[PDB]
Paper text:
X-ray diffraction data were collected to 2.7 Å resolution, but attempts to determine the structure by molecular replacement were unsuccessful, presumably owing to the lack of a suitable search model and the large number of molecules in the asymmetric unit as estimated using MATTPROB. The remainder of the structural description will focus on the unlabelled native protein as this should best represent the natural form of the enzyme. With this structure in hand, the crystal structure of wild-type IdmH was determined by molecular replacement using a single subunit of IdmH-Δ99–107 as a search model. Electron-density maps were well defined for all ten protomers in the asymmetric unit, allowing all chains to be modelled, with the exception of some residues at the extreme N- and C-termini (residues in the ranges 1–6 and 143–148). The ten molecules in the asymmetric unit for the wild-type protein form five almost identical dimers. The following discussion of the IdmH structure will therefore focus on the dimer formed by chains A and B unless otherwise stated, as this represents the most well ordered dimer based on an analysis of the overall B factors of the chains. Two loops (residues 38–46 and 99–108) are located near to the entrance of this hydrophobic pocket and limit the access to the proposed active site from the bulk solvent. Interestingly, the loop, which comprises residues 99–108 and is partially truncated in the IdmH-Δ99–107 variant, appears to occupy two distinct conformations within each of the five dimers in the asymmetric unit. Indeed, in each dimer each protomer has this loop occupying either a more open or a more closed conformation above the hydrophobic cavity. Whilst we cannot rule this out as an artefact of the crystallization, this suggests that this loop is likely to be highly dynamic in solution and may also hint at a potential change in conformation between the two protomers, suggesting the potential for allostery in this enzyme. Indanomycin was placed in the wild-type IdmH active sites (chain A and B) using in silico molecular docking.
Indanomycin is an antibiotic from the pyrroloketo­indane family which is known to act as an effective ionophoric agent against Gram-positive bacteria. IdmH is a homodimer, with the individual protomers consisting of an α+β barrel. Each protomer contains a deep hydrophobic pocket which is proposed to constitute the active site of the enzyme.
Author numbering:
A (entry chain A): 6 to 146
B (entry chain B): 6 to 143
Amino acid sequence: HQPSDTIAGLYEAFNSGDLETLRELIAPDAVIHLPGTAGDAEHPPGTPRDREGWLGVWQFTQAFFPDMTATVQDIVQTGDLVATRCVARGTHSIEFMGVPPTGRPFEMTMLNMSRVRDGRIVEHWTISDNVTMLAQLGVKA
Amino acid sequence: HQPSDTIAGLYEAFNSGDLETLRELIAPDAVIHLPGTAGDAEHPPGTPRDREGWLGVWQFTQAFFPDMTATVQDIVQTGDLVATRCVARGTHSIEFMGVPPTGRPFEMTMLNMSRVRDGRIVEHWTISDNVTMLAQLG
């Protein structure tokens, strides 16, 4: 099952809130390298997480940016590896970091690389340009 | 050059300080999307830069992390697009945020994507795991 479709499906699933598909497309024991911003006490910056850890982080993000969508811009494959560039678009519609909602939009780059075996993600690296998002939210005209 | 070699050459050039090669491998009018951490007053987070802007930022980084090296771990290509995962290693020789140098090593992930036309980079996206670097520095 072609690895580029696995990754296109993954982001369609994240956008629609479709946990059943996400569990089909990601192995339970997949190694997920989230950036250091996603670290906590139990999981220091640079230590990997499993699928449910990743989905836990995603669930928490959906609470602050419920209209957020990741759109694949470029996609690149060689064998079981797939790399994507996405754009996350959304609004400041929920209060966060102590600032009440402004409605202001944001558009930030995500870069990802994933290893896909048997139609499922088994390793994944991702980083988002979080500082640019914050800059965009503090600058309308 | 096959695009994967252009990108391997690019990081060999950054590691050795080889500005002549970097100018061969990057078009002058290339669009460089650096992460928001690389912004300044003249160039807000998310605004692109040209080759000389990028090299200017790199030169400035070499003042604080003079032994820093990027090593390509994985590389992936399809047409003109190449994507890489690198590891930046260096040592903590300069005080930051009031915490003194330790001499300890640090290791952070970079992800990159580059468009290569006629053996030269014409567009480039990069992001580094900056928070992990700061955690490593203590």
